[PDB]
Amino acid sequence: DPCSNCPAGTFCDNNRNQICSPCPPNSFSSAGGQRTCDICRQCKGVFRTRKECSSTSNAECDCTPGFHCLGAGCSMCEQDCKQGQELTKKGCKDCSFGTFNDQKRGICRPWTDCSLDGKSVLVQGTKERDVVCGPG
Amino acid sequence: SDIQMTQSPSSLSASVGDRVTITCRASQSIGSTLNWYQQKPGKAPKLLIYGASSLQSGVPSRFSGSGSGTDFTLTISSLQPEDFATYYCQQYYTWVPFTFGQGTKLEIK
Amino acid sequence: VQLLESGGGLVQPGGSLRLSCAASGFNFGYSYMSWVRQAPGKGLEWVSSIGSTSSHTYYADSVKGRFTISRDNSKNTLYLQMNSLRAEDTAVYYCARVYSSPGIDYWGQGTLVTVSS
C-alpha cells in the first residue's frame, strides 16, 4: 500500500487525489506511514518546554531549577537529590554501605581507606560523611 | 477531539485476599504520564500512583502501577476491605486538558 | 494541608456563582491550582487550571468564555467565577493541587453547583 511511502511529518490520508497530507498543527509524525499524527505533549504544570514540537518531533520536556527530569521521556519532576544519596535510574536512592555523599547534587564515592595511607579509622563514615583518619 | 482513556473493565467483582488487575488504555502513546486515583463513595479522590509506577506517600505496597505507551495496569494484591472503591486513571501528557478514564468500580461477591 | 470549597448552590440556567477554595498548610503561591468537576453518578472532568505565575489561565472547551479562574496568593484563595451557567454544569466542583509531583495529591471536599433545568 502507498502509505508506507509517506515521510515523517505527514500522515496517510483517506482523501483521494492525495496519498498523504502534512500533520495538522500541534501534532507530529516522527516516522513514515502512520495513518495519524500523535498530539504534541504539553510541557505545562510542573514541566517546562525544553524543545518545541515540530511536525516531525515531539516537544521534549524539562524540569524546574532545583529539580531533575525523572522517568522515560521525562514523565516526572524529582527534586534534586539531598546529601547522603545519589540520583539513579529509579530516582533518588541512598548511598551504599562504605560510600558517602557529603553534598547536595552529588554522587556516592567510597570512604577513604585509612590503612592504605598507613593510618587508622579514628571516626567511621556515614552515608553523608567520610571516615576521619588518625595515626597508627 | 483529545486523548481518550479507556479503562477495562467497567465493573469488577472480587473477594478479599485476591490480586486484581485494572486496565487503562490511552488512545495514543503517552509515555508514562499516567496517574491512578481511588474514590470511595461520597469522599474526594486520593492519589495512588503518579508517573504510572511510583506510589504516593501513605499508599500501601499492595497497590502497584505498571505500563508504558498505550496499555497500563493497576494491580492490587491481597485485596483488603478498604480497597473497595471506584478507581480512575488520569493522563498529564496534555495539561490542557488532562483527561481521566470512565472509572472501574471494584465490588464484592 | 487543607482546601475548603464554598459558594456552590442551586441556580436557574443563565445565572452565575462565585466558587472559593481556601488553602492552608502549604505554599499556595508555588502551586498549580485546578478545578475538577464530577456530576452526580458520573466521573471526573477537568474544568480549569491556573499556574503559580497566575498569568496562565487554562480552560476546558465547554466552559471557555463563561468561567474565569483567578487567585489571591495574599489571602491564599482560589476562585471560579462561573457565569452563564448551563444545565450540563450541575456537578460537585473540587479544587485540586499539583505541588511537585505530576499527580494531583491534595483535593478539597467539594461544593455542589446545581442548575434547575
Residue numbers in the entry:
A (entry chain C): 26 to 161
B (entry chain B): 2 to 110
C (entry chain A): 2 to 118
From the paper:
4-1BB (CD137, TNFRSF9) is a co-stimulatory receptor transiently expressed on various immune cells, primarily on effector T cells upon antigen recognition through their T-cell receptor, but also on regulatory T cells (Treg) and natural killer (NK) cells. The natural ligand to 4-1BB, 4-1BB ligand (4-1BBL) is a trimer expressed on antigen-presenting cells. In this study, we describe the development of ATOR-1017, a FcγR-conditional 4-1BB agonistic antibody, designed to outperform the first generation 4-1BB agonists in terms of safety and efficacy.
The data were processed in XDS and Aimless in space group P22121. The final model includes ammino acids 26–161 for both copies of 4-1BB, amino acids 2–118 for the heavy chains and amino acids 2–110 for the light chains of the variable domains of ATOR-1017scFv. In a 4-1BB ligand blocking experiment it was demonstrated that ATOR-1017 blocks the 4-1BBL binding to 4-1BB. This was further confirmed by X-ray crystallography of ATOR-1017 in scFv format complexed with hu4-1BB, which demonstrated that ATOR-1017 interacts with residues on domain 2 and 3 of 4-1BB forming a binding epitope for ATOR-1017 that overlaps with that of 4-1BBL but not with urelumab or utomilumab. The binding epitope of ATOR-1017 was determined by crystallography to be located at domain 2 and 3 overlapping partly with the 4-1BB ligand binding site but distinct from the binding epitope of urelumab as well as utomilumab. The selected binding epitope provides a strong, FcγR-conditional, agonistic activity, in contrast to urelumab that induces agonistic activity also in the absence of FcγR engagement. Further, the superior functional activity of ATOR-1017 compared to utomilumab and other 4-1BB antibodies in IgG4 format, such as ADG106 and CTX471, that bind 4-1BB with similar binding potency indicates that the epitope on 4-1BB is decisive for the agonistic activity of 4-1BB antibodies. The affinity of ATOR-1017 to human and cynomolgus 4-1BB was determined, using BLI, to 0.1 nM to human 4-1BB and 0.2 nM to cynomolgus 4-1BB.
